[PDB]
Amino acid sequence: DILLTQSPAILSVSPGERVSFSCRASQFVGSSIHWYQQRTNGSPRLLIKYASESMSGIPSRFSGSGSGTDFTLSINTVESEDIADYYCQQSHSWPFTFGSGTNLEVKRTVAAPSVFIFPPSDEQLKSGTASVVCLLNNFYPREAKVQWKVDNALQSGNSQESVTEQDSKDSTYSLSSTLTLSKADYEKHKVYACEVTHQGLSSPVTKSFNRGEC
Amino acid sequence: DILLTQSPAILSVSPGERVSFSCRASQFVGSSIHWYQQRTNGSPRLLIKYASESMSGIPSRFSGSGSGTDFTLSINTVESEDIADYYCQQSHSWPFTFGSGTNLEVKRTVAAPSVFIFPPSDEQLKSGTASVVCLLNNFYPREAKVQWKVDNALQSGNSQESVTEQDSKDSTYSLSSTLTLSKADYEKHKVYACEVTHQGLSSPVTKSFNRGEC
Amino acid sequence: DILLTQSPAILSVSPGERVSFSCRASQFVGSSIHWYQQRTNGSPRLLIKYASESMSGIPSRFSGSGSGTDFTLSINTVESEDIADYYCQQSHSWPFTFGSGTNLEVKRTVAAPSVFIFPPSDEQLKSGTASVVCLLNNFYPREAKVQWKVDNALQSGNSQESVTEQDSKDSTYSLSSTLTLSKADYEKHKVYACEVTHQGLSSPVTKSFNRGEC
Amino acid sequence: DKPVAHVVANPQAEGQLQWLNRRANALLANGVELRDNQLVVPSEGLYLIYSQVLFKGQGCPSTHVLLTHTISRIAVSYQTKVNLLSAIKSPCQRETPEGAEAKPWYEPIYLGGVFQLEKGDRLSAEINRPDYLDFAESGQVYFGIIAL
Amino acid sequence: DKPVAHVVANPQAEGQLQWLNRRANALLANGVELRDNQLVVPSEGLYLIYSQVLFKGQGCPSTHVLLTHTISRIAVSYQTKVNLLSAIKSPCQRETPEGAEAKPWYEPIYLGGVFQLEKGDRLSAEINRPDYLDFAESGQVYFGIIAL
Amino acid sequence: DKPVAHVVANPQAEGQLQWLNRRANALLANGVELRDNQLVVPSEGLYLIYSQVLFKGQGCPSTHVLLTHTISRIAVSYQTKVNLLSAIKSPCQRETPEGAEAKPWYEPIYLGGVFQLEKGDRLSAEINRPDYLDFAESGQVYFGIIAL
Amino acid sequence: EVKLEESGGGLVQPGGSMKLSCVASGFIFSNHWMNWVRQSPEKGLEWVAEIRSKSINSATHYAESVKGRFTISRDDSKSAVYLQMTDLRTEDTGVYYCSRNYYGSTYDYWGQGTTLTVSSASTKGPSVFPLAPSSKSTSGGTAALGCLVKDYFPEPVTVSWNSGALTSGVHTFPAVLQSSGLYSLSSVVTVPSSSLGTQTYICNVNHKPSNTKVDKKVEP
Amino acid sequence: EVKLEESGGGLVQPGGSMKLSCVASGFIFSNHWMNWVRQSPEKGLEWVAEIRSKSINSATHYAESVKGRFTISRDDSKSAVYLQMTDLRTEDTGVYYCSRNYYGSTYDYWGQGTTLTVSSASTKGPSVFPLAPSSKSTSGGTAALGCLVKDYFPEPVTVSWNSGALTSGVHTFPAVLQSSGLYSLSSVVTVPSSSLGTQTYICNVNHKPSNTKVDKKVEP
Amino acid sequence: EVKLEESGGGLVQPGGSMKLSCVASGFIFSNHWMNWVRQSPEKGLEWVAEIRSKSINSATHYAESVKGRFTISRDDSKSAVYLQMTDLRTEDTGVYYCSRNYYGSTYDYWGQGTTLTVSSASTKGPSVFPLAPSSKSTSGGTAALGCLVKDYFPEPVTVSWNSGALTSGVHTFPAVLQSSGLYSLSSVVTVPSSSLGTQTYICNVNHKPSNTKVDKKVEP
């Protein structure tokens, strides 16, 4: 039941450069190693078969090699359209097995997040609950910090964040931070602030609003 | 020395229908089974090779299958042109062997025999022998009974019958019945009758003649 | 380490005829025997591979056969352009080995040598040495005898001969005989004669010259 | 009577090479035990060790298709797996063209040799492709040892 | 001295696998008899049983061409034929194209194992294609047993 | 304790089949000697004799490519080489088309049988293509005999 | 192309049964080996079962982990493969892919997956709120609007915009599990302020496990 | 096409010898394996012998039943295969087919067979009588006429009509063995009464085993 | 074509080293197995070493006779193979051919060879004398002229005529070893007497082992 290791699990590379993915088998697999791309919200797509043979329709810039137990997938002149997880598969032994996958980030010039804040809809206030949503849009790299201050009071424990997978046209990420409150505590403060910091910002942007306005 | 059984030995099928031929090997033969057609007065003709691969020029309506020891030839939309014996052959073991063969009859609407009688030629009477010949022509199905009556005396022991193989254009048979007599006994009776019965006749036809007439 | 015998080592054949080359392996080599031509001042050229398969561009008149240990190369309608050494090679066993080679002479109508004599250059006489050169040009067959007589004195020990490989357009040979003398002994005789005998000459031709003349 | 085994494949097994101790023409006696699909040697000494697997595959996705067969030892002490006998076969050949349907093929492998074994040693006969194991008839897959 | 046989193919045979008892490097002694192309075991006990056939074929009409080799037992009592050892090989490959001439090929098969046999048991090593039997050199085809 | 050998290929050898007497899972004892790549039998008697070579080739210049494996005897008296066991395999197949790059392939061969040997007999296991010898892993190439 | 379409996923309690279906076109179906392969974040890609061609008899093969619980079958007539799952486990939870394996090698083609959630918790459709586009707070000249798709179970929900037309600018965030045990998520899009007055922006939230299908029109 | 033509059959006494010949065209003869295959009603189809290509040395193969009695050979120059039979047996009686086997598999092509009759009985040509077309007894408007081909040995005889031209309407009955030990048979044809007056109907009986060749003109 | 060009031969003392080079074009070099094969009159053709493809690791192979003394290598980038010879022996003397072996079978292609002379004797360039065309002694109407290329070491020298143009009529004799230990040889050509007055005849002798390069103009 052959085991496949893909380390490193993450790679991050400037456009134009060459990237290499590692796949190691715990035992001899001859050349029965195959490579796959899996884009966001996509199914796996076969790139190379038997270590080095590329499938048709697959860009020339993709190649593979290796034999015995050590194998490599290579993309040179990497481009954002290559942003994906990459898995290897062996078919030497039954049953067929897969590697854990390596993720590819194609780097980009720094890009600060465009920050937006959404006060909770009225329809949601009926039901006695307030969701306050801050949007950090299209920034690079993935490192950001969001902060909630309600009437300048720094929050804690009452927000959750969700980050997108790197975008394959413009190489950015986006993140949503949601502050959730009881319709009660909500109606007892006026000014809600989202305070985002990020490498592309010389000092933290903060968007805010006043409960019941505009 | 592998043995091949083809049972049933006879099959009989209405046009348009699908027929299936059985071939069973007494031992494993993998897929090394081949099928042949042999029309009347013809040599064997290879239809399918290795269980299921049809030869070119062979009509699509012919197919085969089977593996190990049980095999089948199939003709669907059978037509009279398919009237033949069919043999299977194995080439798994040396020496190569054949099945006993299955005969195909393609059925037809009932057809009563056109009866003809031939009095013995004079040239044959010289030599002191009389052959009286009754022809049952183009009937279906193959079951018929011929009777000889000489001066209304029903004969016994002194005739022989010969039936043709089913005709491949019109799906009929023909049968000849020959009454053979010494020029002596012949010249001592006047009226020779051939009395044929058959499914297509509501009552027996009989053709007859009078010795020395016309 | 398989040994290949090519006997006979020499073959000699009239144009148009068929020649056969022998190659024998000391052990089984299956059909892994290959044949090569090597013209004068040339590298080996592959003619046939695996006993009998001719390479493309190779004239149809070349064929091979044999299997196990006895093999043959055949040229029919031999022509002078076929003048070469022929080698066989086995690739059944490692390391690959070659036969000693068979030489092909394509016969020709008899041709007597055109004889020329060259007295030693002055430039060579400076340095105190005399090389006297006799040229037997374009004769067939290869058997010739050259003789030196200096002032009618038959020489011995002081000449060397060099013969060319058979010419592939005109099927002849040429031979040079060089009489070498000290500038001293040379200047002490007048008339140097080269006396060539050959099958195409009814009596020996002799070219001669007189020291210091013309 | 010497330590002896000759076990066979489990016909009613499941894309699996499972050794069966108890059939008509097999052996498990004189101290040899079958244990986790491994033959366990009772005493020390010289053993002949042998095995055959028969593969029936179908289709040739590539020339690179490999079949392997290997007999390995696990000493009581060391406790690590070592290959005693091992062979590899490439059953293809060509590459079934597509639109083309796959055709069956048969490849047997045989291993066998004599080795000094230790009491409590384990032995296993393993293949890489049990999904291609053919035991539709007897005598096709088997694992054995006798003490000499 | 234990019951022992190692017989070979009859070179002067005829698209036929015929076992020959008496040559230079063979054995037929200690009670084993050759009888109707079958080795007959004298006493009961453990036997090693082995065989090799070498096929030299020519041409590949189909991928479906099979070579088989099988050793079978016929017990005095039962009297029915049972396969002890058995392998199948598909030597083709591709399919010689037509207009194309057939090329030779070589395939060896080896069988061997240890079995409990009964006095008066018969053993046969049989192939499916004796027409492809190669014994143009010695050591290529052979059948054997020793009692241990 | 009976005359016994089980030697293996020299991994650090050189397009060469060189038998190594002294590794972890081999045998050279009880009078059998390794001598010029030949096993030398100490006493007379019945021996089981066996061998496996594994070839890893690359490319198929022709269908005619052959691999051979053969065990031969050289009696002290006669002094001439005789084949006891011998097999031939044709590993190709098709013919790599040109512009096409060569692909690897694996072929194992196994030989084995029992023979009456004489004191001072030499035995050799020889192949035709040592350049294709695969011993990148253990258990793949080996030569052996035991006295019974 | 070559298409694989699987379906029949959804929520089941532990111990339950569920049947999956896959329809194939674009190759000779009866020739090929059809597979199920599942994927989860914990376990990654995992081969589940294979059904080979007629010529092999069916020849079914199961992963050790589903042996005796799952049954693979095919209807060559319909170009269909099925996975009948029984005695379902929490771990069996994941996206299940129909896929062709090319005669024992590569996974040639994949469907788009269908999701199995094995869980005792009850279905619960989402409630969609509008994240309304601000006026002055729109880092001109680009506007941000969205839908809050809140408190639902189980995954997944699918959010559209303009019933398919509006693709660019859209970020539908990965769902997040709240301590309440339900899934929240937002889908945002960024657009021209210019088009705010003239264009109609609707999110089309769909949550099959509860037959919920909301169409929040989002506007200032 | 690809043609195989065999010849050289006929009657022989037990113990006798007879040589069969087959000429081939339409494939590279030297490449292929030529076979004899015989057929009898009792035994059906039975492979007799093979001769393989030059490349194999001849490589001859015989059925157990003819080993040591029959010899197969080829002349690649003439595209010919031969079967030399000696010490002939009653059982050896049958139709013998030249045939190509495709490199150890299928019988690719067959000749049209040649008949061997091994028997002590003596040759005897047939006597042909006319079965004359009746006048009023012709179920109008179709007429029946024939030839009685009586008392001959051994099989076969070949009956034609109009020396080849008249094919349709013709039934040449299977020969029948009379107690006298000889073969009788009739060949009938059915024709338009209309053409009775204008058309000429001749049967062309031929019996090679006795060099008999009759041409009965049949008329009222 | 497909070209192989080897170089780097010449004289070395026993024990010395010398590197040979071969550049290839006209096939995919990285795919193929490159070989050195040497040839001598005594020993004939002798395989020396092979270097196989990347895919095999290099896989180097040496003849028993050069094991441990010679090293074969390749630079797939340059389409080059090398033979580094060390501890050279007299016997190693010969013409060395670069050559491709086709995947363990045939020697597909050969260079034109480069000569190794292992010897203690010292380099020595030739002195070229003219063999001047006679006047009356020219079996009219054909004239014979030449160059004596005398006392040199080691082999070979290459003699041209008209710096390439004059090919027909030319016999450059096999070199001969004089007792002095040096090589003499003549190159003759036969021409029209007619052209004697109008044509210019130059021999271009070249002896790389000594950087000698003479151009004797030959005339009456």
How far apart, in whole angstroms, are the C-alpha atoms of residue F94 and residue E103? Answer: 11
Torsions phi, psi for I92 (to 5 deg): -70, -10
Cβ-Cβ contacts under 8 Å for B58 (sequence gap 6 or more)? B47, B48
| Residue at a domain's end among C78, C108, C138 | C108
Q: Which of C75, C108, C141 is the last residue of a domain?
A: C108
Residues of B in contact with H134 (CB under 8 A): 116-118, 214
CA distances, E114 to each of E71, E111, E119, F4 (Å): 12, 11, 16, 19
Nearest CA in chain D to A96: D129
Residues C136 and C84 in one domain: no
Domain that holds residue A92: 1-108
The backbone torsions φ and ψ at residue A140, rounded to the nearest 5 degrees and listed phi first, read -155, 135
> Could you tell me which residues come within 8 angstroms of residue I186 by beta carbon, excluding any fewer than 6 positions away?
C133, C135, C162, C176, C178, I131, I146, I147, I148, I149, I172, I173
Interface residue of F49, F67, F106 to substitute, partner D, most D CBs within 10 Å: F106
Number of domains in chain C: 2
CB contact under 8 A, E131 and H56: no
How many Å apart are CA B66 and CA G212, to the nearest integer?
52
Taking CB atoms within 8 Å and a gap of at least 24, the contacts of E29-33 are E29/E1, E29/E3, E29/E4, E29/E5, E30/E1, E30/E2, E30/E3, E30/E4, E30/E147, E31/E3, E32/E3, E32/E4, E32/E5, E32/E145
- Answer whether the bond into residue H2 is a cis peptide, omega within 30°: yes
Structure tokens given for D80? 């690590």
Pair (B124, B66) in one structural domain: no
Cβ–Cβ gap D131/G104 under 8 Å:
yes
Give the closest-approach CA distance of B87 to chain H in angstroms: 9
The tokens describing E5, both together, are 């046989």
Q: Which helix (H) or strand (E) holds H38?
A: strand H33-40
**CA-to-CA distance for D18 and D14, rounded, in angstroms?**
9
Domain ranges of chain F: 1-148
Facing residue for I44 by CB, picked from C101, C121, C160: C101
Q: Do F110 and D111 touch (CB under 8 A)?
A: yes
Query: Does the CB of E128 have a partner CB in chain B at under 8 Å?
Result: yes
Strand partners, E142: E8, E52
What the block records as the tokens of G128 is 């969609």
**SS3 state at D63:** coil
- The 10 Å Cβ neighbour count of residue C213 is 8
In this structure, the answer to whether residues A37 and A125 fall within a common structural domain is: no
CA dist A27 and A30 (Å) reads 9
Helix (H) or strand (E) holding B125: helix B122-126
Q: What number of other Cβ atoms are within 10 A of residue A95's Cβ?
A: 20
**List of residues 6+ apart from E32 with CB closer than 8 A:** E3, E4, E5, E39, E40, E41, E42, E145
d(CA H47, CA H83) in angstroms, rounded, equals: 13
CB atoms within 10 A of CB H73: 15
Chain F residues 8-37 with a CB less than 8 Å from chain E = none
Count of residues in chain C: 214
Phi-psi region of B183 (alpha: psi -120 to 50; beta: other; left: phi over 0): alpha
Residue of D nearest to F147 (CA): D148
Q: Collapsing DSSP states into helix, strand and coil, what is residue H29?
A: helix
**E74 vs chain F: nearest CA distance in angstroms?**
23
Residues 6+ apart with CB under 8 A from E148: D2, D146, D148, E2, E45, E46, E47, E48, E114, F148
Q: Are residues A66 and A29 in the same domain?
A: yes
CB E64 to CB B30 under 8 A? yes
**Residue with token string 């030299």:** E56
List, as ranges, residues 20-49 from G with C-beta within 8 Å of A.
Answer: 44-47
Burial letters A20-50, b for 16+ CB under 10 A, else e: ebbbbbeebbbbbbbbbbbeeeebbbbbbbb
Describe the strand order of the beta sheet including I3-7 as a list of residue ranges: I3-7, I18-25, I80-85, I70-75
CB neighbourhood size of B61 (10 A): 14
CATH of domain H1-120: 2.60.40.10
* Segment (H or E) for H98: strand H94-101
Inter-CA distances, I173 with C44, C119, C132, C162, H50, Å? 21, 18, 15, 6, 61
**Residue reference for tokens 């085969």:** B64
Residues A115 and A31 placed together within one structural domain of the fold: no
DSSP assignment string, B179-191: EEEEHHHHTT--E
Q: How distant is the alpha carbon of residue F125 from its chain centre?
A: 4
Q: Which residue of I has its CA nearest to C92?
A: I105
CATH of domain H121-220: 2.60.40.10
Same domain, B72 and B136: no
DSSP I175: P
Which of D148, D146, D135 shows the shortest CA–CA distance to D8?
D135
Residues A83 and A127 in one domain: no
Displacement of CA B159 from its chain's centroid (Å): 20
Region for residue B16 given its phi and psi (left: phi exceeds 0; alpha: psi -120 to 50; beta: otherwise): left
Strand, helix or coil for residue I213: strand
CA separation for the pair I113, I97 (Å, rounded): 4
- Tokens standing for residue E66: 């099979």
Instruction: Measure the CA–CA gap between E120 and E33, rounded to whole angstroms.
Output: 10
**CA distance linking residue D26 with residue D131, whole number of Å:** 23
Distances C160 to B193, C163, C176, C181, I174 between C-alpha atoms, Å: 117, 10, 8, 12, 12
C-alpha distance from residue H21 to each of B37, B117, H4, H46, I138 (Å): 25, 43, 10, 18, 71
Q: What 3-state DSSP class applies to C125?
A: helix
Domain of residue C57, CATH code: 2.60.40.10
At residue B122, the 3 state secondary structure works out as helix
Give chain A as a 3 state SS string: CCCEECCCCEEEECCCCCEEEEEEECCCCCCCEEEEEECCCCCCEEEEECCCEECCCCCCCEEEEEECCEEEEEECCCCHHHCEEEEEEECCCCCCEECCCEEEEECCCCECCEEEEECCCHHHHHCCEEEEEEEEEEEECCCEECCEEECCEECCCCEEEEECCCCCCCCCEEEEEEEEEEHHHHCCCCEEEEEEEECCCCCCEEEEEECCCC
Residue type, C59: P
* Cα R_g (chain B), whole angstroms: 23
A 10 A CB-CB count for H40 gives 14
For B123, the enclosing helix (H) or strand (E) is helix B122-126
Enumerate residues 39 to 78 of chain B having a beta carbon within 8 A of any beta carbon in chain H. Answer: 43-46, 49-50
CB G176 within 8 A of CB A162: yes
CA-CA-CA-CA dihedral for F34, D47, D125, G57, to nearest 10: 110
Strands (E), chain D: 4-9, 19-20, 27-29, 33-35, 38-40, 45-58, 67-74, 81-89, 104-117, 122-127, 142-147
Q: List chain H domain ranges.
A: 1-120, 121-220
Q: Three-state secondary structure along A97-151?
A: EECCCEEEEECCCCECCEEEEECCCHHHHHCCEEEEEEEEEEEECCCEECCEEEC
What is the identity of the amino acid at G167? T
Nearest to F129 by CA among G74, C92, I127, G201: C92
Look at residues I195, I219, I13 and name the one whose alpha carbon lies nearest to residue I118. Answer: I13
Best to test chain F binding among E105, E133, E134 (most F CBs inside 10 Å)? E105
Token readout for G14 is 């532990």
Entry field: residues in chain H: 220
Q: Which chains touch H (3 or more CB pairs under 8 A)?
A: B, E
C-alpha closest to that of I205 among I218, I194, I192, I214: I214
Interacting residues of F67 by C-beta distance below 8 A, sequence separation 6+: F55, F57, F88, F89, F90, F91, F107, F109, F127, F128, F129, F132
Q: β-pairing, G10-12 with G114-118? A: parallel
Do B94 and B115 have their domain in common?
A: no
How far, in Å, CA of C137 to CA of G156, rounded? 99
Q: Of A59, A84, A108, which residue is a domain's last?
A: A108
H36's enclosing H/E stretch is strand H33-40
Query: Which DSSP state fits I169?
Result: T
> What's the rounded Cα separation, in Å, for the pair H2 and I204?
66
Q: Token digits for H117?
A: 């009759």
State both tokens at D10. 């489990």
Q: Is H56 exposed, middle or buried (0-12, 13-18, 19+ CB in 10 A)?
A: middle
State whether A94 and D15 contact (CB < 8 Å).
Answer: yes
> Whole-angstrom Cα distance, residue D79 to residue D77?
5
Determine contact, residues A83/A104, Cβ cutoff 8 Å. yes
Residues D95-116 as b or e (16 or more Cβ within 10 Å = b) = bbeeeebbbbbbbbbbbbbbbe
A77 in the same domain as A116: no
Q: Do F65 and I52 touch (CB under 8 A)?
A: no
Closest residue in D to F60 (Cα–Cα)? D93
For F70, list phi and psi in degrees, rounded to 5: -150, 135
The dotted CATH code for E1-148 is: 2.60.120.40
Q: Which of F82, F79, F58 is closest to F70 using CA atoms?
A: F82
Show the CA angle centred on residue I44, arms to residues I39 and I47, nearest 5°.
60
Q: Which amino acid is located at G200 in the chain? A: T
Q: Rounded to 5 degrees, what angle do the CA atoms B196, B197, B202 make?
A: 125
**Are F112 and E50 inside 8 Å of each other by CB?**
yes
Touching I (3+ Cβ pairs <8 A), the chains are C, F
Residue E57, token pair as written in the block: 């074929």
Tell me the two tokens of residue C196.
Answer: 């060539």
As a whole number of Å, the end-to-end CA separation of chain I is: 44
Neighbours of chain B (3+ CB pairs under 8 A): E, H
End-to-end CA distance of chain A: 63
Among residues C178, C190, C119, the alpha carbon closest in space to that of C146 is found at C178
Both C197 and C185 in one domain: the answer is: yes
CA G163 – CA G184 distance, rounded (Å)? 21
Q: What is d(CA G194, CA I119) in angstroms, rounded to the nearest whole number?
A: 93
Neighbours of E80 (CB within 10 A): 9
G156 burial (CB, 10 Å; 0-12 / 13-18 / 19+) is middle
The pair phi, psi for residue F23, each rounded to 5°, is -135, -160
